[PDB]
């Protein structure tokens, strides 16, 4: 079965609770991995959380988070939606500091960037054995998605970008078919800025919503086709998106300057010219998360919604957040079902540990009654080491 | 396959023990979660032990039980038969503070509870996929069976409760079919209360045992068929099967009002006017076990009865217990197998450690000989935290 | 695919070591079960390690061996063979502190007995499922053979004894099929004394080697066919099995009385009138492991011998020993192939530690060339708690 | 399928990372095996690490190094690649101070060999099962490849040494059918000396490198077809390749006497008259690790080379590295791929700890881009114990 991906996105009204692994609160007993970017994926046949670790474990000497980012043992892994995070549940995908993965129907592809900031090589696999690599274009820290890429009869596409994270950058879309780049074509985006991008499959093309981290509190999308035909522009709704922002306020189809400097990972999904936002609660601290619909945010600029969905509470720590979603071929249904995940970052640089890590909860959007409520991570900080 | 319902409860003389997982007494020193209501259910291919944990190992600090019972971190977990629960063995299953799972023949179902007191929704998954959500009616702690539900020629069945657990409630019946509510019906029972229902099938039917926590010391039932057409009563016995309860004596068919208040998870089943009832030792303390075969118990109020299996010592302490059936299409009989579990507390409120947490046996009815004993929990408590 | 068990044993002149677990050396660290008689069974497909368990870990407080042997808290768990027994890689199979398994071709019979010693019961199960029960009918510790049962033309067989461990007893036949005994005899056997008997299926039939713990330095055998029609002797030579015994010297065909009480349960191989015989090296304490092939063995009182191969230093402990076989099944050879395991005993009443158990070596029956040497537990005794 | 193994090599550019498993790191706090020669081989299906461990876990006495290398205690086991090897996740495979495995197709081939130096002997299992075994033929330690062996068109080809270390040994080369062994040669190699070859399929033949641990500091080779009709030599380039080794100069198609006596295991890839070299980054020391392109190397003597890529940096510590290969019926493509994995070595004898271990990490050939780095181990030593 090789994923259609012709679906439109399923009609919702709410998003419902999917999962929680409590991995920062079972890891002051167990064995569990520090990570951070716990993104979940599906295949036609179940759903794993996908993560980096610097491998090493909760409650440890070598969780001591002044190790680079990008170190030569960060590492790609994944385990079964929901549980705890390790090294005796968790599966290795590749060595990576950065990454992206998907499943087509009929295998995974998982993409590990490594190697040094001037010169970084993503290694791309199919069924876990090598059958591509990207290197460095620009010489300047190679990095992709941190969640799942986008899988449409029998390709997945995802987003690099090469180049500065505090000025004008690189952007290229790749269409990769059985772990084998086939096409790829860089955007012409003069004063765009696109990093850590969510990036969904909706009608047969597919829609990225992502993280400008260079002058935009509004996030950047691009579309494209299986062609990579594209389109691109900032969600237009003055319900800012990033963290950090402004109050919500006017917003534009273009960056919005104000508080645009950095940003955090996140996805939103578009319905017709609506728009359902995930975001954090605070606007200048990675605190809580909530969901918005607005029915008019992805081409109009006002600041009015319709309705909130509170995920976790403002006096919580949240983190990074991407979107995934379930196939017809997974689900039974005739529409493609919006979930996403969000991760709950303890640790540094807020909290007084050696480490930092994130635990995760999903939701799935669905079109029946649900309820808003706080789920954190729980863990009472510090632990032993 | 469907399981198609249709046998009757086989013949039995007595309980054969068919598991004790030493939950605790391994977690000692292992890594083991910290749970409750450790529910069995099968499929026509293997058995499964249900857990809800509050995402908290033993001997650890985040066992800490003030933790509310109804807390954002509880999740629904499953693990082999017999296997201590533990974060490298178990399966995730549902966000969930109360909580049902069963088999069609086809696909697992769990139900799982999460929410705000004022709003909990249960979320319902088939082959791990949400299927549908049922948000509270009464706004007052909705809440379901804590074992399994029941299925019948693909439909499955279970009871949930919302309003007091001190005085009259709401309490409903559910079908269910892959996942989606396809029929409901609330019980007209003024007077009665029922709480964490045993739902066993029999004869194409479903009959529950549950819990009044109001002001019954002999145990409610429902019974219904696949339209919902439902009878209601009380077990008549005298030979009382809540706790507390009073001395046994004369029983009635209506809720017994001495030492009515409270209760526990119990259940018992019904074979022609006869009953099995299990239940505590003691009448005052969550101690004991045993199972009691009155035969004309299910319609006639004496406190006669005709066998007495121990299954636990008074001298130890037991807690919630609960049906399961094995179904002909798993074990190749003609008629329907009926077996308990005993969940075993230890800790708070009766023994003095930061937590409170249950192990587990469970026995299958068989026509062949048997014998009583004591299969508690055996842990040496407190622990180190 | 039922196993015929037609073939004869593969001819063979020494032993080829298949296995070691390291099980107690492990457990210096990781979570691993104190144990006991970790004997060895295989089905068409694949061989496993079963062994009981008092459901506690070495280095904690539960391993303390005051704990009675038959405890309520004692099960049959089984593991892949070769790995540490833990709560992690085990599978649960029954409740017992006795107890036998053995495949088919088509599925596992698991036998556990458990109940106080004046009316044990022993729940067979057939692919997990209860199928039959046995009560104790001498009313003195039911027991069985701690090691594999025998399966020939999809019926398997096992040897339960009640009754005295010190004087005559009762010894019966059991024939089973997918789990359900049908068919026993009691051995007509005065001044027998039949335990732990290890089984094996040769040409269509069983042999079984035994412990007479009354007063026999020799070990008993039976043998029978499908029908239970049976034979009973003593192996007559003078190279002695059991330990205690005396020096080698001149044996009986029945019971040899010298250092006759007491005993361990261990195993020997009948070719022709020879036999290999597996036993201790030391007459007198549990320590050292050997195997000799004494080529008139069986009926021939001598105390000559041809060949003796080292298995472990008498300066180290052994413990009990069994036979298991792989058939053609499994091999794809012509003829059953004849295996044995060996438990090294660690801990009280030698050792200064709280605790007892042990790890183990198996071998394989090989023609082609071999060598003796030592493989001894290895643990360094006592651990931290 | 059987792996034909006629294909012959893939063009490659250079080395694409393909795992690291942080095993050092990660057991500073979870339970993971103290281990040597972490092997990778595949099969038609999945990649594994094999390795050989004292039964010992990391952070425990029993790790305590002064154990002899050649133990009773020393198995062979296996995890998934990438995965820290733990009693949790590993598969035992064979007792074994001495290995090999190959998968032909159809099954696994593990030689393991045990017993006294004067009298070894290798076992040697298919699907697990004991298939044939080899003893000592010059009583002086026989050991083998400590990674794969070869497999091709359903023949598994492999090198045994016996005899010393530091002077002439015997030689043979073993052709091993469903793990039966139907042929063997004995080299007519006079001043050659093999130890630990690293073999590869090619083009319907088998390549070995080795280490000359007499008297060479250039790399023995054996190349041979499926009669076992053999060629040998020496790597002729003055890119020397073993540890220790003098400063690159003028090679030799003999053993290059200077700084010849002790060595590493290798490995090298010939391409035509060219040569893919993984050697150490020091000439004195186990440090460092880099790839060495020598278009020319295998046949002339000269010091020239075209590409180096960096593996491991000079100021980390590396050890054994080998090859292994991944079949077209594994990867899908036309040619044979070569791949490689390297150990890290932490411990005795250079650094103050009790124990000795080591980490892995593997590269792929590729012809796409690829990047020099240095992939450590990483691990902050000492440990607690
Ligand atoms: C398991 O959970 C239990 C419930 O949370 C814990 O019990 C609680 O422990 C805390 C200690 O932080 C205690 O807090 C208050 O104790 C006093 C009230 O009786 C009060 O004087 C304290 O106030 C002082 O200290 C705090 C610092 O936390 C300052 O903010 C104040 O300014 C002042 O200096 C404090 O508020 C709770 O009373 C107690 N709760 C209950 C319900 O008994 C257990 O400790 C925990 N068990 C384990 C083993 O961890
Ligand atoms: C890892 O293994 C190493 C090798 O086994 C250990 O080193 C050994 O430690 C032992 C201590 O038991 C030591 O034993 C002898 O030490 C003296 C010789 O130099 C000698 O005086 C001792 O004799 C005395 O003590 C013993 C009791 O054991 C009595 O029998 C005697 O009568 C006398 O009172 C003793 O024989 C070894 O020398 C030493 N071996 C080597 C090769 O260095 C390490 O201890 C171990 N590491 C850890 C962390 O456990
Ligand atoms: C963590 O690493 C940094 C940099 O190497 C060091 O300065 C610091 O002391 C370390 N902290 C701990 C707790 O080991
Ligand atoms: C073990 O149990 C016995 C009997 O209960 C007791 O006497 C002894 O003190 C215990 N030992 C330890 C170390 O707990
Ligand atoms: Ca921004
Ligand atoms: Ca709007
Ligand atoms: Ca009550
Ligand atoms: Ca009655
Ligand atoms: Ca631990
Ligand atoms: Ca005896
Ligand atoms: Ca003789
Ligand atoms: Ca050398
Ligand atoms: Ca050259």
Not at 172 to 184: D, H, M, P, R
Not at 209 to 223: A, I, K, Q, T
Not at 225 to 249: A, E, H, K, M
Not at 337 to 348: A, D, K, N, S
Request: aromatic fraction near 10%.
């Amino acid at each position: 079965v090789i994923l259609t991906g012709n679906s439109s996105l399923c009609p919702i009204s709410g998003w419902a609770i999917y999962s929680k692994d409590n991995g920062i609160r079972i890891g002051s007993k167990g064995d569990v991995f520090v990570i951070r970017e716990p993104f979940i994926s599906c295949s036609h046949l179940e759903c794993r959380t996908f993560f980096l670790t610097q491998g090493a474990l909760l409650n440890d000497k070598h969780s001591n988070g002044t190790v680079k980012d990008r170190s030569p043992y960060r590492t790609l892994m994944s385990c079964p939606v929901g549980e705890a995070p390790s090294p005796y549940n968790s599966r290795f995908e590749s060595v990576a500091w950065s990454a992206s993965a998907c499943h087509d129907g009929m295998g995974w592809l998982t993409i590990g960037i490594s190697g040094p900031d001037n010169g970084a090589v993503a290694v791309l696999k199919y069924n876990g054995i090598i059958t591509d690599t990207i290197k460095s274009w620009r010489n300047n820290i190679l990095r992709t998605q941190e969640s799942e890429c986008a899988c449409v009869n029998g390709s997945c596409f995802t987003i690099m970008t090469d180049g500065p994270s505090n000025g004008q950058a690189s952007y290229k879309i790749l269409k990769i078919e059985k772990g084998k780049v086939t096409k790829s074509i860089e955007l012409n985006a003069p004063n765009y800025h696109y990093e850590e991008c969510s990036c969904y499959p909706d009608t047969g093309k597919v829609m990225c919503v992502c993280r400008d981290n260079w002058h935009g509190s509004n996030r950047p999308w691009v579309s494209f086709d299986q062609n990579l035909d594209y389109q691109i522009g900032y969600i237009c709704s003055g319900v800012f998106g990033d963290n950090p922002r402004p109050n919500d306020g006017t917003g534009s189809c273009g960056p919005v300057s104000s508080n645009g400097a950095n940003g955090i990972k996140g996805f939103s999904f578009r319905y017709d010219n609506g728009v359902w936002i995930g975001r954090t609660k605070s606007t200048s601290s990675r605190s809580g998360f909530e969901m918005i619909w607005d029915p008019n945010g992805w081409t109009e600029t006002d600041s009015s919604f319709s309705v909130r969905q509170d995920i976790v509470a403002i006096t919580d720590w949240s983190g990074y957040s991407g979107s995934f979603v379930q196939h017809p071929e997974l689900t039974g249904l005739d529409c493609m079902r919006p979930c996403f995940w969000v991760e709950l970052i303890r640790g540094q640089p807020k909290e007084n540990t050696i480490w930092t890590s994130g635990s995760s909860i999903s939701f799935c959007g669905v079109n029946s009654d649900t309820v808003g409520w706080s789920w954190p991570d729980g863990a009472e900080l510090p632990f032993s080491i």
